Design a protein around this ligand. Structure first.
Ligand SMILES: [Mn+2]
Length: 285
C-alpha cells in the first residue's frame, strides 16, 4: 500500500466560533460554527464535534479524524479540521440539512423518486471509494448520511471504520446496531465490504419508507433468529419489484454473491434516468 501523506491541519481555538448545538447524547455533541482559517478573512460554515466528558474514546476519535483527513470524495465527509483545546474537536464542512434519516421524515410529502434514486447512487458512489481504499465502514445507516443540499449527500461517522491490510479480506472484532448488520457479522463478526453492502440494503430501505424503523417493535434478541429463518424487510409501498429485488440481493446469505457497490451505483444510475418507472410516489413527475 502507498504511503499516506495527507496533511492533518491543527486548528487554534481562536479560529473557531461555536454558534449552536446541532445534536447531543451518548455519542457526544455536534456544534454549528464559523471557522476562520489562520490568517485569512473568509468565514467557513462548520460543524464541530466533541466528546461528552467521559478511556480509549479520545484515541479513537483521533483515528476517526485520520480517516476523514485522508480522503477527498464528494460523498464522504472530509476533516478540515482538528482542534485540541480545551478538548479534542473534529471540524468538518457544515452540512446544513442535517442527517438523511430525519430529512426523509420531515419532507416525506415533498420527496420524489428522482431524489430517492439519486441518494441510492451517491451513497453507493461513496461506498465505492471506500472499497478502493480498503475501508470497511461497519456502521452504514441513514442516520450516518448527511445532507449538504437536497441533491447532495455524504457518508459520515467513520468511528468504527477499519482498514483492511495485506491479504486480509475480513475484519474481526464495537456497538453498531444489530438491525443494520449482516447475518455473518452477527454470528462470526466477519466484517467486509460485502457486509457493508447488506447495511446499504437496510439504509436505502430506510429511505424508501421515508424514515422507517426496520423490524419495528421486534426486540434485538429476536433478530438473529428472524434472519436465520430467511425473513427480510418488507417491500416498501412505493417500491417496484425492480427496486426491492436490489434490496433483497444485498440481504442474501452468501456475502460474496451480493452485488458490489460498483454494480449498485451503475444499476441505480440506470433507474435514475427514468425514476417514475421504478418508484411509485403520490404526486410525482
Ligand atoms: Mn431492544
Amino acid at each position: 500500500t502507498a504511503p499516506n501523506q495527507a496533511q492533518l491541519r491543527i486548528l487554534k481555538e481562536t479560529e473557531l466560533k461555536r454558534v449552536k448545538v446541532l445534536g447531543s447524547g451518548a455519542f457526544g455533541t455536534v456544534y454549528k460554527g464559523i471557522w476562520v482559517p489562520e490568517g485569512e478573512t473568509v468565514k467557513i460554515p462548520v460543524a464541530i464535534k466533541i466528546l461528552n466528558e467521559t478511556p480509549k474514546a479520545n484515541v479513537e476519535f483521533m483515528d476517526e479524524a485520520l480517516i476523514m483527513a485522508s480522503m477527498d470524495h464528494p460523498h464522504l465527509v472530509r476533516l478540515l479540521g482538528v482542534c485540541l483545546s480545551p478538548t479534542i474537536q473534529l471540524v468538518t464542512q457544515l452540512m446544513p440539512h442535517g442527517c438523511l434519516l430525519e430529512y426523509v421524515h420531515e419532507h416525506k410529502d415533498n420527496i420524489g423518486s428522482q431524489l430517492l434514486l439519486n441518494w441510492c447512487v451517491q451513497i453507493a458512489k461513496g461506498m465505492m471509494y471506500l472499497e478502493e481504499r480498503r475501508l470497511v465502514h461497519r456502521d452504514l445507516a441513514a442516520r450516518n448520511v448527511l445532507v449538504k443540499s437536497p441533491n447532495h449527500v455524504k457518508i459520515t461517522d467513520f468511528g468504527l471504520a477499519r482498514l483492511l491490510e495485506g491479504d486480509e479480506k475480513e475484519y474481526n472484532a464495537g456497538k453498531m446496531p444489530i438491525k443494520w448488520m449482516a447475518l455473518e457479522c452477527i454470528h462470526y463478526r466477519k466484517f467486509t465490504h460485502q457486509s457493508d453492502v447488506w447495511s446499504y440494503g437496510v439504509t436505502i430501505w430506510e429511505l424508501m419508507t421515508f424514515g422507517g424503523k426496520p423490524y419495528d417493535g421486534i426486540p434485538t434478541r429476536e433478530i438473529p433468529d428472524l434472519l436465520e429463518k430467511g425473513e427480510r424487510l418488507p417491500q416498501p409501498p412505493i417500491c417496484t419489484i425492480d427496486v426491492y429485488m436490489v434490496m433483497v440481493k444485498c440481504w442474501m446469505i452468501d456475502a460474496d454473491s451480493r452485488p458490489k457497490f460498483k454494480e449498485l451505483a451503475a444499476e441505480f444510475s440506470r433507474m435514475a434516468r427514468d425514476p417514475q418507472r421504478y418508484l411509485v410516489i403520490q404526486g410525482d413527475d
